[PDB]
């Protein structure tokens, strides 16, 4: 018993495999819908160029982390 | 010479083929990216349930029209 199967499933096709400077990365909305053939990272650059990036990369593990901590500034 | 090929291409897979009441349709953002395997209509219902609908249907031709004229009210 599905429910809302006619949904625009936001998915990707390629992945910015170039070390994109964390500066260009204005934000990151990791894609991962159950209907997408492949997961990805929506590195919303500064120009709003949502770039799907392979989360299994070694440069997205660092960048995606600063975005993972670029919202609220923790304290010590 | 491409440019931004690692983009999250918002596409669909199925299409609400049931005559969805124009009331449920809160808005419509017709999908049609050059990377999507199929065009569609993002009938943003009231619950924000973006429903990709076949623009080649006979009920989406009427609904999609009221959405096509549900923004500004023309005058005579």
Short mmCIF file of C-alpha atoms in Angstrom, two decimals:
data_model
loop_
_atom_site.label_atom_id
_atom_site.label_comp_id
_atom_site.label_asym_id
_atom_site.label_seq_id
_atom_site.Cartn_x
_atom_site.Cartn_y
_atom_site.Cartn_z
CA UNK A 1 0.00 0.00 0.00
CA UNK A 2 2.16 2.82 -1.33
CA UNK A 3 1.16 6.45 -0.85
CA UNK A 4 2.37 9.37 -3.04
CA UNK A 5 4.35 7.33 -5.53
CA UNK A 6 4.05 10.02 -8.21
CA UNK A 7 6.66 12.15 -6.48
CA UNK A 8 9.36 14.26 -8.10
CA UNK A 9 12.28 12.31 -6.73
CA UNK A 10 15.24 14.70 -6.55
CA UNK A 11 18.21 12.55 -7.60
CA UNK A 12 21.62 13.05 -9.27
CA UNK A 13 23.57 11.51 -12.17
CA UNK A 14 27.21 12.60 -11.79
CA UNK A 15 29.30 13.87 -8.86
CA UNK A 16 31.73 16.83 -8.58
CA UNK A 17 34.85 14.68 -8.17
CA UNK A 18 37.08 17.77 -8.06
CA UNK A 19 38.14 18.98 -4.60
CA UNK A 20 35.65 21.86 -4.43
CA UNK A 21 36.95 24.49 -2.02
CA UNK A 22 34.87 24.54 1.19
CA UNK A 23 34.51 28.25 0.39
CA UNK A 24 32.51 27.58 -2.76
CA UNK A 25 30.32 25.26 -0.74
CA UNK A 26 27.64 27.56 0.64
CA UNK A 27 25.70 24.60 2.09
CA UNK A 28 25.03 20.85 1.70
CA UNK A 29 21.65 19.01 1.45
CA UNK A 30 22.67 15.32 1.25
CA UNK A 31 20.26 13.61 -1.17
CA UNK A 32 19.17 10.03 -0.36
CA UNK A 33 15.52 9.49 -1.32
CA UNK A 34 14.44 5.82 -1.36
CA UNK A 35 13.55 6.38 -5.04
CA UNK A 36 16.97 7.78 -6.09
CA UNK A 37 19.20 5.21 -7.81
CA UNK A 38 22.19 6.73 -6.02
CA UNK A 39 22.77 8.79 -2.85
CA UNK A 40 24.72 12.07 -3.11
CA UNK A 41 25.53 15.41 -1.47
CA UNK A 42 23.87 18.58 -2.67
CA UNK A 43 26.83 20.89 -2.05
CA UNK A 44 24.90 24.14 -2.62
CA UNK A 45 27.84 26.25 -3.82
CA UNK A 46 27.67 30.07 -3.53
CA UNK A 47 26.02 30.54 -6.84
CA UNK A 48 23.33 28.07 -5.74
CA UNK A 49 24.91 25.48 -8.05
CA UNK A 50 23.66 22.40 -6.19
CA UNK A 51 26.50 19.95 -6.86
CA UNK A 52 25.79 16.32 -6.14
CA UNK A 53 29.07 14.99 -4.72
CA UNK A 54 30.00 11.38 -3.88
CA UNK A 55 29.80 11.13 -0.07
CA UNK A 56 32.29 8.25 -0.37
CA UNK A 57 35.00 10.68 -1.57
CA UNK A 58 37.94 11.83 0.57
CA UNK A 59 37.43 15.55 -0.11
CA UNK A 60 33.68 15.51 0.48
CA UNK A 61 34.31 13.86 3.87
CA UNK A 62 36.17 17.01 4.92
CA UNK A 63 34.05 19.62 3.13
CA UNK A 64 30.72 18.00 4.04
CA UNK A 65 31.99 18.14 7.64
CA UNK A 66 32.53 21.89 7.72
CA UNK A 67 29.04 22.20 6.25
CA UNK A 68 27.97 19.72 8.89
CA UNK A 69 29.27 22.31 11.35
CA UNK A 70 28.80 25.59 9.51
CA UNK A 71 25.34 26.30 10.95
CA UNK A 72 25.45 26.99 14.70
CA UNK A 73 28.82 27.70 16.35
CA UNK A 74 29.33 25.37 19.35
CA UNK A 75 31.06 26.66 22.51
CA UNK A 76 33.68 25.37 24.97
CA UNK B 1 32.40 21.70 -22.81
CA UNK B 2 29.80 20.93 -20.16
CA UNK B 3 29.56 22.99 -16.98
CA UNK B 4 27.97 21.78 -13.69
CA UNK B 5 27.21 18.24 -14.78
CA UNK B 6 27.21 16.96 -11.20
CA UNK B 7 23.80 18.50 -10.57
CA UNK B 8 20.96 17.06 -8.53
CA UNK B 9 18.54 16.67 -11.40
CA UNK B 10 15.02 16.84 -9.94
CA UNK B 11 13.09 14.23 -11.94
CA UNK B 12 10.07 11.94 -11.43
CA UNK B 13 9.26 8.23 -11.90
CA UNK B 14 5.45 7.88 -11.80
CA UNK B 15 2.57 10.31 -12.35
CA UNK B 16 -0.64 10.93 -10.33
CA UNK B 17 -3.00 9.56 -13.00
CA UNK B 18 -6.03 10.15 -10.75
CA UNK B 19 -8.04 13.32 -11.39
CA UNK B 20 -6.60 15.27 -8.46
CA UNK B 21 -9.05 17.98 -7.43
CA UNK B 22 -7.74 21.45 -8.39
CA UNK B 23 -8.36 22.21 -4.70
CA UNK B 24 -5.68 19.79 -3.55
CA UNK B 25 -3.33 21.36 -6.04
CA UNK B 26 -1.77 24.23 -4.10
CA UNK B 27 0.65 24.98 -6.97
CA UNK B 28 2.47 23.45 -9.97
CA UNK B 29 6.22 23.56 -10.83
CA UNK B 30 6.40 21.72 -14.19
CA UNK B 31 9.62 19.67 -14.19
CA UNK B 32 11.56 19.40 -17.48
CA UNK B 33 15.32 19.43 -16.84
CA UNK B 34 17.42 18.36 -19.85
CA UNK B 35 18.80 15.59 -17.59
CA UNK B 36 15.38 14.17 -16.56
CA UNK B 37 14.38 11.04 -18.50
CA UNK B 38 10.79 12.29 -18.51
CA UNK B 39 9.03 15.67 -18.18
CA UNK B 40 6.28 16.07 -15.56
CA UNK B 41 4.22 18.51 -13.48
CA UNK B 42 5.06 19.12 -9.85
CA UNK B 43 1.48 19.63 -8.66
CA UNK B 44 2.43 20.90 -5.17
CA UNK B 45 -0.71 19.75 -3.36
CA UNK B 46 -1.75 21.47 -0.09
CA UNK B 47 0.29 19.22 2.08
CA UNK B 48 3.33 20.08 -0.06
CA UNK B 49 3.07 16.61 -1.64
CA UNK B 50 4.80 17.49 -4.93
CA UNK B 51 3.00 15.15 -7.33
CA UNK B 52 4.60 14.65 -10.71
CA UNK B 53 1.66 14.45 -13.12
CA UNK B 54 1.69 13.57 -16.84
CA UNK B 55 1.23 16.89 -18.68
CA UNK B 56 -0.19 14.82 -21.56
CA UNK B 57 -3.21 13.86 -19.42
CA UNK B 58 -6.71 15.29 -19.89
CA UNK B 59 -7.22 16.22 -16.23
CA UNK B 60 -3.81 17.84 -15.80
CA UNK B 61 -4.55 20.03 -18.84
CA UNK B 62 -7.43 21.57 -16.88
CA UNK B 63 -5.89 21.58 -13.40
CA UNK B 64 -2.46 22.78 -14.59
CA UNK B 65 -4.38 25.62 -16.26
CA UNK B 66 -6.01 26.91 -13.10
CA UNK B 67 -2.56 26.77 -11.52
CA UNK B 68 -1.32 28.50 -14.65
CA UNK B 69 -3.78 31.24 -13.68
CA UNK B 70 -3.96 30.97 -9.91
CA UNK B 71 -1.21 33.52 -9.24
CA UNK B 72 -2.24 37.04 -10.28
CA UNK B 73 -5.92 37.75 -11.02
CA UNK B 74 -6.27 39.39 -14.46
CA UNK B 75 -8.88 42.13 -15.03
CA UNK B 76 -11.42 43.04 -17.74
#
